[PDB]
Amino acid sequence: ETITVSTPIKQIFPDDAFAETIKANLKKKSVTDAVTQNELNSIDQIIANNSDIKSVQGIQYLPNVTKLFLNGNKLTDIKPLTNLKNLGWLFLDENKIKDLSSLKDLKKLKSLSLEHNGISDINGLVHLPQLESLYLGNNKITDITVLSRLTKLDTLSLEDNQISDIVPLAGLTKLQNLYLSKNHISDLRALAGLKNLDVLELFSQEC
Ligand SMILES: [Ca+2]
């Protein structure tokens, strides 16, 4: 939603680490300083890697965010992201995010990164058919059936997981970069029809 009157940053963003991020973004002197919606409207990018952030509550008030870099934090819940309709790039590596339902309405999302989140179920990704690049390296994924729906992907990383069957990738003709090292892949027939592959990594398979 939005704030109708000047309000302290610390009152909108509960997480003190995140509050500091917003303060820095708006070039404010303190998280205790007051901010207006006009000021919150100015944020289209948040860079806060390894910032010890546990919650992004309050981010719902930033309607124009398109880029969000939150790698290496302590996130678990991303429900606050649900209505950030303009999100185009979302990097959330090194967190503990598993509920991907909050991403279902991010129809402008082109790049998503969720490496090292201990994820095994990615069926919620079906709601992002427009995705162009997806990074899911270092997780516990085995079933990638849902990926057959992501026909716009040109870059995909699934390295360091527990995948055996890559047939779901057979129809992703736009793929140019495919990272599949450190998995359990034996059958590579699914790669036959991928006419645009430039980069392909398949080393260290354990069968
Ligand atoms: Ca606080």
mmCIF file of C-alpha atoms and ligand atoms in Angstrom:
data_model
loop_
_atom_site.group_PDB
_atom_site.id
_atom_site.type_symbol
_atom_site.label_atom_id
_atom_site.label_comp_id
_atom_site.label_asym_id
_atom_site.label_seq_id
_atom_site.Cartn_x
_atom_site.Cartn_y
_atom_site.Cartn_z
ATOM 1 C CA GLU A 1 0.000 0.000 0.000
ATOM 2 C CA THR A 2 1.135 3.573 0.706
ATOM 3 C CA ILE A 3 1.787 5.984 3.567
ATOM 4 C CA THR A 4 -0.451 9.053 3.667
ATOM 5 C CA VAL A 5 1.743 11.075 6.002
ATOM 6 C CA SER A 6 5.434 11.491 6.830
ATOM 7 C CA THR A 7 6.548 8.425 8.810
ATOM 8 C CA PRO A 8 9.844 7.245 10.376
ATOM 9 C CA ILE A 9 11.743 4.694 8.300
ATOM 10 C CA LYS A 10 12.008 2.412 11.343
ATOM 11 C CA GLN A 11 8.202 2.370 11.599
ATOM 12 C CA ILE A 12 7.712 1.122 8.021
ATOM 13 C CA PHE A 13 10.624 -1.311 7.887
ATOM 14 C CA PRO A 14 10.725 -3.438 11.112
ATOM 15 C CA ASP A 15 13.995 -5.156 10.202
ATOM 16 C CA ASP A 16 16.740 -2.777 11.328
ATOM 17 C CA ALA A 17 19.154 -4.072 8.707
ATOM 18 C CA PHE A 18 16.585 -3.455 5.988
ATOM 19 C CA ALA A 19 15.677 -0.089 7.521
ATOM 20 C CA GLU A 20 19.332 0.914 7.202
ATOM 21 C CA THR A 21 19.268 -0.224 3.562
ATOM 22 C CA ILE A 22 16.299 2.056 2.818
ATOM 23 C CA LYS A 23 17.920 4.939 4.721
ATOM 24 C CA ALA A 24 21.083 4.544 2.649
ATOM 25 C CA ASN A 25 19.040 4.254 -0.541
ATOM 26 C CA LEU A 26 17.265 7.547 0.120
ATOM 27 C CA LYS A 27 20.488 9.148 1.357
ATOM 28 C CA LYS A 28 18.855 9.893 4.716
ATOM 29 C CA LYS A 29 20.920 10.495 7.859
ATOM 30 C CA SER A 30 18.970 8.143 10.121
ATOM 31 C CA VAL A 31 16.445 5.303 10.112
ATOM 32 C CA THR A 32 14.573 7.465 12.603
ATOM 33 C CA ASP A 33 14.116 10.154 9.941
ATOM 34 C CA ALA A 34 10.649 10.506 8.463
ATOM 35 C CA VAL A 35 9.881 9.659 4.841
ATOM 36 C CA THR A 36 6.934 10.258 2.528
ATOM 37 C CA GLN A 37 5.384 8.074 -0.157
ATOM 38 C CA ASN A 38 6.926 10.338 -2.803
ATOM 39 C CA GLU A 39 10.295 9.342 -1.406
ATOM 40 C CA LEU A 40 9.372 5.647 -1.282
ATOM 41 C CA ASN A 41 8.166 5.960 -4.887
ATOM 42 C CA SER A 42 11.703 6.942 -5.938
ATOM 43 C CA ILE A 43 13.118 3.490 -5.195
ATOM 44 C CA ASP A 44 13.450 1.261 -8.247
ATOM 45 C CA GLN A 45 16.464 -0.650 -6.995
ATOM 46 C CA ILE A 46 17.677 -2.165 -3.743
ATOM 47 C CA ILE A 47 21.204 -3.485 -3.371
ATOM 48 C CA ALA A 48 21.622 -5.249 -0.063
ATOM 49 C CA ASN A 49 23.698 -8.414 -0.372
ATOM 50 C CA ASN A 50 24.999 -10.027 2.836
ATOM 51 C CA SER A 51 23.304 -7.400 4.987
ATOM 52 C CA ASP A 52 21.920 -9.652 7.720
ATOM 53 C CA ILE A 53 18.329 -8.927 6.657
ATOM 54 C CA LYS A 54 15.712 -11.292 8.131
ATOM 55 C CA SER A 55 12.575 -9.590 6.814
ATOM 56 C CA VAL A 56 11.680 -7.227 3.968
ATOM 57 C CA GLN A 57 8.375 -6.206 5.572
ATOM 58 C CA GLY A 58 7.631 -2.671 4.418
ATOM 59 C CA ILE A 59 8.886 -3.299 0.899
ATOM 60 C CA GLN A 60 5.198 -3.460 -0.075
ATOM 61 C CA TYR A 61 5.297 0.357 -0.071
ATOM 62 C CA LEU A 62 7.843 0.546 -2.908
ATOM 63 C CA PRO A 63 5.649 0.289 -6.044
ATOM 64 C CA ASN A 64 8.443 1.070 -8.525
ATOM 65 C CA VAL A 65 11.080 -1.508 -7.560
ATOM 66 C CA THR A 66 12.392 -3.429 -10.556
ATOM 67 C CA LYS A 67 15.715 -4.733 -9.233
ATOM 68 C CA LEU A 68 16.223 -6.413 -5.886
ATOM 69 C CA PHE A 69 19.600 -7.859 -4.851
ATOM 70 C CA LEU A 70 19.263 -9.673 -1.524
ATOM 71 C CA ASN A 71 21.864 -12.445 -1.799
ATOM 72 C CA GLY A 72 23.318 -13.875 1.399
ATOM 73 C CA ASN A 73 20.811 -12.695 3.969
ATOM 74 C CA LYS A 74 18.508 -14.475 6.451
ATOM 75 C CA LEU A 75 15.247 -14.357 4.509
ATOM 76 C CA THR A 76 12.619 -17.100 4.827
ATOM 77 C CA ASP A 77 9.407 -15.264 4.006
ATOM 78 C CA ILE A 78 8.996 -13.264 0.812
ATOM 79 C CA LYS A 79 5.250 -12.616 0.986
ATOM 80 C CA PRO A 80 5.974 -8.852 1.093
ATOM 81 C CA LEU A 81 7.106 -9.196 -2.559
ATOM 82 C CA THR A 82 3.712 -10.419 -3.751
ATOM 83 C CA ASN A 83 2.490 -7.145 -5.254
ATOM 84 C CA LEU A 84 5.749 -5.669 -6.558
ATOM 85 C CA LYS A 85 4.343 -5.906 -10.098
ATOM 86 C CA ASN A 86 7.325 -4.160 -11.695
ATOM 87 C CA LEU A 87 9.982 -6.544 -10.422
ATOM 88 C CA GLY A 88 12.292 -7.544 -13.276
ATOM 89 C CA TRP A 89 15.376 -8.927 -11.512
ATOM 90 C CA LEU A 90 15.255 -10.822 -8.210
ATOM 91 C CA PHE A 91 18.399 -12.337 -6.669
ATOM 92 C CA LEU A 92 17.862 -14.241 -3.435
ATOM 93 C CA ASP A 93 20.809 -16.661 -3.265
ATOM 94 C CA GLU A 94 22.019 -17.814 0.147
ATOM 95 C CA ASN A 95 18.764 -17.446 2.091
ATOM 96 C CA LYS A 96 16.241 -20.018 3.299
ATOM 97 C CA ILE A 97 13.321 -19.252 1.012
ATOM 98 C CA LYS A 98 11.111 -22.212 0.089
ATOM 99 C CA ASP A 99 7.591 -20.792 -0.340
ATOM 100 C CA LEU A 100 7.598 -19.548 -3.942
ATOM 101 C CA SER A 101 3.866 -18.819 -3.991
ATOM 102 C CA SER A 102 4.621 -15.123 -3.420
ATOM 103 C CA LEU A 103 6.169 -14.954 -6.901
ATOM 104 C CA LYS A 104 3.055 -16.046 -8.828
ATOM 105 C CA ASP A 105 2.035 -12.504 -9.793
ATOM 106 C CA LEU A 106 5.459 -11.169 -10.768
ATOM 107 C CA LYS A 107 4.664 -11.311 -14.481
ATOM 108 C CA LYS A 108 7.432 -8.893 -15.480
ATOM 109 C CA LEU A 109 10.133 -10.910 -13.728
ATOM 110 C CA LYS A 110 12.835 -11.833 -16.255
ATOM 111 C CA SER A 111 15.645 -13.010 -13.979
ATOM 112 C CA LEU A 112 15.309 -15.004 -10.769
ATOM 113 C CA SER A 113 18.105 -16.362 -8.573
ATOM 114 C CA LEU A 114 17.497 -18.723 -5.648
ATOM 115 C CA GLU A 115 20.736 -20.651 -5.322
ATOM 116 C CA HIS A 116 21.636 -22.153 -1.956
ATOM 117 C CA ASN A 117 18.164 -21.914 -0.384
ATOM 118 C CA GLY A 118 17.717 -25.609 0.392
ATOM 119 C CA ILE A 119 14.903 -25.765 -2.156
ATOM 120 C CA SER A 120 13.502 -29.051 -3.458
ATOM 121 C CA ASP A 121 10.062 -28.069 -4.785
ATOM 122 C CA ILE A 122 10.004 -25.598 -7.672
ATOM 123 C CA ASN A 123 6.493 -26.254 -8.998
ATOM 124 C CA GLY A 124 5.533 -22.708 -8.032
ATOM 125 C CA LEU A 125 7.694 -21.494 -10.911
ATOM 126 C CA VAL A 126 4.974 -22.502 -13.368
ATOM 127 C CA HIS A 127 3.519 -19.026 -12.765
ATOM 128 C CA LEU A 128 6.554 -17.343 -14.372
ATOM 129 C CA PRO A 129 6.429 -18.412 -18.059
ATOM 130 C CA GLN A 130 8.155 -15.185 -19.161
ATOM 131 C CA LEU A 131 11.361 -15.947 -17.213
ATOM 132 C CA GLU A 132 14.565 -15.485 -19.262
ATOM 133 C CA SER A 133 17.259 -16.510 -16.777
ATOM 134 C CA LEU A 134 16.893 -18.822 -13.790
ATOM 135 C CA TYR A 135 19.542 -19.831 -11.246
ATOM 136 C CA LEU A 136 18.724 -22.712 -8.907
ATOM 137 C CA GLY A 137 22.213 -24.037 -8.282
ATOM 138 C CA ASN A 138 23.127 -25.719 -5.002
ATOM 139 C CA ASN A 139 19.728 -26.887 -3.841
ATOM 140 C CA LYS A 140 17.994 -30.246 -3.394
ATOM 141 C CA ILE A 141 15.970 -30.388 -6.596
ATOM 142 C CA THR A 142 15.190 -33.712 -8.274
ATOM 143 C CA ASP A 143 12.019 -33.031 -10.235
ATOM 144 C CA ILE A 144 12.256 -30.316 -12.896
ATOM 145 C CA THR A 145 9.044 -31.229 -14.724
ATOM 146 C CA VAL A 146 7.783 -27.655 -14.242
ATOM 147 C CA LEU A 147 10.619 -26.201 -16.350
ATOM 148 C CA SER A 148 9.018 -27.382 -19.591
ATOM 149 C CA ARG A 149 6.657 -24.439 -19.120
ATOM 150 C CA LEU A 150 9.480 -21.875 -19.053
ATOM 151 C CA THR A 151 9.945 -21.698 -22.823
ATOM 152 C CA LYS A 152 11.478 -18.191 -22.735
ATOM 153 C CA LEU A 153 14.587 -19.285 -20.821
ATOM 154 C CA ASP A 154 17.912 -18.632 -22.542
ATOM 155 C CA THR A 155 19.980 -19.099 -19.377
ATOM 156 C CA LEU A 156 19.413 -21.832 -16.777
ATOM 157 C CA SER A 157 21.539 -23.123 -13.916
ATOM 158 C CA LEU A 158 20.623 -26.282 -12.034
ATOM 159 C CA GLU A 159 24.144 -27.287 -11.048
ATOM 160 C CA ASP A 160 24.754 -29.056 -7.749
ATOM 161 C CA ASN A 161 21.342 -30.646 -7.229
ATOM 162 C CA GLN A 162 19.973 -34.200 -7.484
ATOM 163 C CA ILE A 163 18.525 -34.267 -10.970
ATOM 164 C CA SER A 164 18.494 -37.388 -13.141
ATOM 165 C CA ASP A 165 15.856 -36.638 -15.759
ATOM 166 C CA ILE A 166 16.329 -33.597 -17.989
ATOM 167 C CA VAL A 167 13.696 -34.503 -20.578
ATOM 168 C CA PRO A 168 11.679 -31.469 -19.362
ATOM 169 C CA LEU A 169 14.381 -29.288 -20.956
ATOM 170 C CA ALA A 170 13.991 -30.826 -24.410
ATOM 171 C CA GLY A 171 11.580 -28.144 -25.582
ATOM 172 C CA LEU A 172 13.417 -25.099 -24.231
ATOM 173 C CA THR A 173 14.841 -24.209 -27.652
ATOM 174 C CA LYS A 174 15.888 -20.710 -26.574
ATOM 175 C CA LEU A 175 18.484 -22.049 -24.124
ATOM 176 C CA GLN A 176 21.974 -20.706 -24.795
ATOM 177 C CA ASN A 177 23.558 -21.298 -21.388
ATOM 178 C CA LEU A 178 22.859 -24.496 -19.454
ATOM 179 C CA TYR A 179 24.701 -25.401 -16.245
ATOM 180 C CA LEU A 180 24.056 -28.963 -15.087
ATOM 181 C CA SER A 181 27.270 -30.058 -13.371
ATOM 182 C CA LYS A 182 27.149 -31.986 -10.092
ATOM 183 C CA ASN A 183 23.907 -33.956 -10.586
ATOM 184 C CA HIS A 184 22.851 -37.526 -11.516
ATOM 185 C CA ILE A 185 22.400 -37.216 -15.280
ATOM 186 C CA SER A 186 23.110 -40.136 -17.635
ATOM 187 C CA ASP A 187 20.699 -39.598 -20.529
ATOM 188 C CA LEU A 188 21.580 -36.540 -22.624
ATOM 189 C CA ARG A 189 19.118 -37.114 -25.461
ATOM 190 C CA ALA A 190 17.103 -34.101 -24.259
ATOM 191 C CA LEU A 191 19.945 -31.900 -25.497
ATOM 192 C CA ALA A 192 19.577 -33.002 -29.128
ATOM 193 C CA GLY A 193 17.059 -30.347 -30.135
ATOM 194 C CA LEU A 194 18.701 -27.422 -28.319
ATOM 195 C CA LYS A 195 19.946 -25.531 -31.389
ATOM 196 C CA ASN A 196 21.108 -22.402 -29.554
ATOM 197 C CA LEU A 197 23.292 -23.799 -26.777
ATOM 198 C CA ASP A 198 26.660 -22.000 -26.526
ATOM 199 C CA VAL A 199 27.610 -22.834 -22.953
ATOM 200 C CA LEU A 200 26.915 -26.274 -21.506
ATOM 201 C CA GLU A 201 28.348 -27.791 -18.330
ATOM 202 C CA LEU A 202 27.760 -31.474 -17.526
ATOM 203 C CA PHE A 203 30.878 -32.512 -15.599
ATOM 204 C CA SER A 204 30.868 -34.321 -12.254
ATOM 205 C CA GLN A 205 27.707 -36.395 -12.690
ATOM 206 C CA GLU A 206 27.207 -39.164 -10.123
ATOM 207 C CA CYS A 207 25.296 -42.146 -11.520
HETATM 208 CA CA CA B 1 13.156 -2.812 14.235
#
